[PDB]
Design an enzyme around this catalytic site. Sequence first.
Site, short mmCIF file in Angstrom:
data_model
loop_
_atom_site.label_atom_id
_atom_site.label_comp_id
_atom_site.label_asym_id
_atom_site.label_seq_id
_atom_site.Cartn_x
_atom_site.Cartn_y
_atom_site.Cartn_z
N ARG A 363 0.82 -1.19 0.00
CA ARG A 363 0.00 0.00 0.00
C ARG A 363 0.87 1.25 0.00
NH1 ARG A 363 -5.84 -2.15 2.54
NH2 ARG A 363 -5.61 -4.02 1.24
N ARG A 378 -0.40 0.34 10.47
CA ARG A 378 -0.50 0.84 9.13
C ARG A 378 0.89 0.90 8.56
NH1 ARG A 378 -4.95 4.14 7.06
NH2 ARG A 378 -5.71 4.25 9.17
N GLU A 452 -10.46 -1.76 12.73
CA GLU A 452 -10.85 -2.75 11.71
C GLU A 452 -9.72 -3.74 11.48
OE1 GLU A 452 -11.80 -1.24 7.53
OE2 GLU A 452 -10.74 -3.17 7.15
N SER A 455 -12.88 -6.47 6.27
CA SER A 455 -14.00 -5.88 5.61
C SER A 455 -14.65 -6.83 4.64
CB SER A 455 -13.63 -4.58 4.93
OG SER A 455 -12.52 -4.77 4.13
N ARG A 493 -1.11 -6.12 11.63
CA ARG A 493 -2.04 -5.40 12.44
C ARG A 493 -2.71 -6.31 13.46
NH1 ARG A 493 -7.00 -1.40 10.35
NH2 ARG A 493 -5.04 -0.50 9.46
N1 LIG Z 1 -1.38 -0.50 5.57
C1 LIG Z 1 -1.85 -1.57 6.35
N2 LIG Z 1 -1.12 -2.16 7.32
C2 LIG Z 1 -1.48 -3.26 8.02
N3 LIG Z 1 -2.66 -3.87 7.88
C3 LIG Z 1 -3.51 -3.36 6.96
C4 LIG Z 1 -3.16 -2.18 6.15
N4 LIG Z 1 -4.20 -1.93 5.28
C5 LIG Z 1 -5.12 -2.85 5.54
N5 LIG Z 1 -4.71 -3.70 6.55
C6 LIG Z 1 -5.47 -4.85 7.01
O1 LIG Z 1 -6.14 -5.50 5.87
C7 LIG Z 1 -7.54 -5.56 6.19
C8 LIG Z 1 -8.36 -5.37 4.94
O2 LIG Z 1 -8.07 -4.09 4.39
P1 LIG Z 1 -9.00 -3.54 3.18
O3 LIG Z 1 -8.79 -4.48 1.95
O4 LIG Z 1 -8.48 -2.10 3.11
O5 LIG Z 1 -10.40 -3.69 3.73
C9 LIG Z 1 -7.75 -4.44 7.21
O6 LIG Z 1 -8.92 -4.61 8.05
C10 LIG Z 1 -6.52 -4.55 8.04
O7 LIG Z 1 -6.54 -5.88 8.61
#
Ligand SMILES: Nc1ncnc2c1ncn2[C@@H]1O[C@H](COP(=O)(O)O)[C@@H](O)[C@H]1O
Lengths: 527, 527
Positions: A363, A378, A452, A455, A493
């Site tokens: 990311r 993050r 979170e 999702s 996380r």
């Molecule tokens: N930059 C990040 N660092 C660590 N864990 C992350 C990060 N972005 C997302 N996550 C984890 O990935 C899950 C799904 O992210 P998302 O696809 O954005 O819904 C989130 O709920 C966190 O567990």
Amino acid sequence: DLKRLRQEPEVFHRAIREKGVALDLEALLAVDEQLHKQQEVIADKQMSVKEDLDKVEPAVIEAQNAVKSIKKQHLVEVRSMANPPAAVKLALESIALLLGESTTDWKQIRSIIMRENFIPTIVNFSAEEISDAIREKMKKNYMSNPSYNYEIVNRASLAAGPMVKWAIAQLNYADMLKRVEPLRNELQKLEDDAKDNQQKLEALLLQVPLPPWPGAPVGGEEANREIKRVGGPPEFSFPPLDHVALMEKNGWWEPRISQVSGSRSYALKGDLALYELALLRFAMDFMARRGFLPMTLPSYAREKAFLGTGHFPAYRDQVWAIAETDLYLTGTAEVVLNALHSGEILPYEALPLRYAGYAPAFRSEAGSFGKDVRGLMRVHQFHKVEQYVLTEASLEASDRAFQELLENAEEILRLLELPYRLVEVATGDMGPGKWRQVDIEVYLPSEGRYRETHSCSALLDWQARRANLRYRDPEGRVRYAYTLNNTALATPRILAMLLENHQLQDGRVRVPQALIPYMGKEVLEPG
Amino acid sequence: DLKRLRQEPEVFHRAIREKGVALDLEALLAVDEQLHKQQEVIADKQMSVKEDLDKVEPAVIEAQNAVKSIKKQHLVEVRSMANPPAAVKLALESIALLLGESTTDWKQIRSIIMRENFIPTIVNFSAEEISDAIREKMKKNYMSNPSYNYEIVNRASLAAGPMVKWAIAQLNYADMLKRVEPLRNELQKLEDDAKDNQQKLEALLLQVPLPPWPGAPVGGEEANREIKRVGGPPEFSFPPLDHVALMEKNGWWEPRISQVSGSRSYALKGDLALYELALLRFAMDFMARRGFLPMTLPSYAREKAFLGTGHFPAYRDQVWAIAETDLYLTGTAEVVLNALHSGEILPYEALPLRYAGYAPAFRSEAGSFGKDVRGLMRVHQFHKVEQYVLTEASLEASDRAFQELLENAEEILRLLELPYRLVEVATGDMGPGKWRQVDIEVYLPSEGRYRETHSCSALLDWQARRANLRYRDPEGRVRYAYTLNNTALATPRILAMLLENHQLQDGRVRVPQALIPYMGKEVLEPG
Ligand SMILES: Nc1ncnc2c1ncn2[C@@H]1O[C@H](COP(=O)(O)O)[C@@H](O)[C@H]1O
Ligand SMILES: Nc1ncnc2c1ncn2[C@@H]1O[C@H](COP(=O)(O)O)[C@@H](O)[C@H]1O
């Protein structure tokens, strides 16, 4: 779906307002109408140019075969003359002129006629390669001469007759090119206006939102609402540490990484590093027992697969590109997973596809300034197992897989012995392609709130239409599939939550019962 | 090392031909010696300029403190006086001139000198602000006058006295800046030509190679020696399938991945996906038990990390950069692991550092196209557990560390039940910074040959020097450390040797004893 957008103006206006999508749907449809008118005009005009050039092509092909069919004895009784007949000398001069010869010596030019390469150059000759100077010199010296003529020259030589035929066809072709040029230049602009309109439209289209499920809260993020909680905030009888402090006390992290790799980086040491990998495998086994097919995938893809999930163009700025490459690092395995079957018609009996995809994840975190600046919440690169479901086109099937995807993440959190809650996400926070999203959040004591970790999203056919994911129904028609996805488990996380929830009084950290077989111990050693 | 290097123009010269490396050692030295000259030429001229700004600096400060230190009543005295003396008029006049509001109206002067901001702005004024015309004018008009004198006017008004010291000081300073003009102008170029050579020079130092250890065969690849073999090429009573066809038989890979992610990609499914993660954990547990510190690491770093190891610039082209970032994706954890302590002085007692780092790995595979294009042999992204050791500057310490690195890798293959051999790498084939290199290769039946899986290297203080890695010895002297590394295990390439060596008659694949506890079974299950 254009036709569907017209027969349904209200539904899409409401969807657009609900999601906070600035999309002018009439201007979109007016691009579509304007494009269509531009394309029909382009086609009439292309036809006009094509008629013009089709007029002069047969004479070139006729003359070209005539020159080729000149006998050898005839090429000789032209090469024989020191003293050419005037109408015959005119003919050769024009051929020498056209060929780009730089000599008007008769002796010199009577020669190229028997060049091994003469015909070969004549055949390959292109009238587009004639200058205007040679063009005008041809009209002034030779067309304007009464003897410069197939009828007149062919009486005197059956070698020069063909050549005058060929020269005249070329000149005529050349004059037609010249005539056609302004229409061709115009057509060029129209064609480029049109391409630009097609890209302006395709990019409006890729903004059209799915109408959200009727049960979703209507508003931005401030309308998100907790629907459930399971377990609670721990209570410690000691004064609890935050995860960073726990990793310090115990030697479980390598702070020096920010000098090597910059900020939003992390490097785990000792039992915590081993714990991260234990967690990913625990989550993969879990998902495999659940009838989801395990996969390990690359973390990069081409643009087309980000386009198909909706990550591009909307969330383009969250993605790291690989320079001097057409590749982009993926933020989630969903991008690869979603793309595997683009272009295929799946047999209905295969349905549904249930994948548990592991990939490192990347990311940019551009635009995250001031958010989670410290520790494991993050970071730029981290590891995730993703649940991905492809389904036939019914709400029933999709409601079903959404329930399963959610229960899977919950059962994983129960096994990890972590307190969590479910949050219904609002139409304006859901994203444009979503039907329903529910976030799962884990209590994080150091921030005094839930954060979170999962999702869960149902999309219907909105990814399917973008990625061309289709299947054959029992009736024998091809329809676009529905898709859903949810995290199974992401590190590091979840390690933040595990460290702080399962910290013991002496600063050590408990391992939950389900992870003991993976770790060989019940407590992380204070390396 | 410049001095040390030159001290042995024969040692380095021999290392350069031995390693087949292209570095003109004479040119580099010439640049270093020449650079030392430009650096003096620049030391001097910079000095000639401080001296000149040193005559005029102290007087401007004193005057700045003198006006700052004017009593606040010499203020009312001069600014309430109705008609002053002509020398005070002149004085205050000069100052309106210097501040860019020149006039000869005592009133206006009266006016200006009164402004709250009057004092604050002369104390904050800088001679750089003074223009050509002003300098000229302040000389023709005011230096020329005989009443324009500090003492001459420090008598009539105690407020205007320090004002003329400040005005004179500011004028001499402006005059100094003016002649130092072309002086400070030569510097800018000399210095750019100086930095140019730092770059060209340090660019070339990075090409200097380590002399190889005296027991390494001399010459190219053709001079690499088999030093040991363990296990044998398998024999089957059936026709052995190659790994891609075994993966194909059992439903263990997704070939669609190359439409999604491009060539040299891979996606495992089912039991093989699980096996890949099991292998990484297995290798990590084994390294922990050997007393190496387990770590999980990112797969990107800034340029410095690559410079430090020797990946930059020698192999910059095998590396993927991350666009609009100062980061690059690492092909091995060795790049992060070696950079961790850059800049530190490690205490002697921490030595040796023994790290088993896990990270995803990425390679462009630039240069190598038309080799290992299909299958798991050469893919763009993979997984690697790496061994890394940082030791006292001691042959003794490095030799023991190298044998343990080698044996670690050997017991992992033995445990994996894989026939392997060790190859002593020749000088022309080891790489520029190597002391010793032993490759370990594993028999791949489909190809009829051993294929590298590990490259064990010792680099003495080659990387230390480039990455500034140092330790304090027992006598308390700071010395560069020695570094070493070797793979522990890498997937998926290791899986191609496992499938093929381990394949059964019925087409399925056996799990070596050491991985049974990780897989929960003895034979890989097909889809
Ligand atoms: N930059 C990040 N660092 C660590 N864990 C992350 C990060 N972005 C997302 N996550 C984890 O990935 C899950 C799904 O992210 P998302 O696809 O954005 O819904 C989130 O709920 C966190 O567990
Ligand atoms: N492109 C690749 N694909 C798969 N495995 C690789 C690749 N490059 C290196 N490896 C593995 O890593 C080992 C040592 O790599 P190195 O760190 O380059 O010495 C090799 O002998 C292979 O097992």
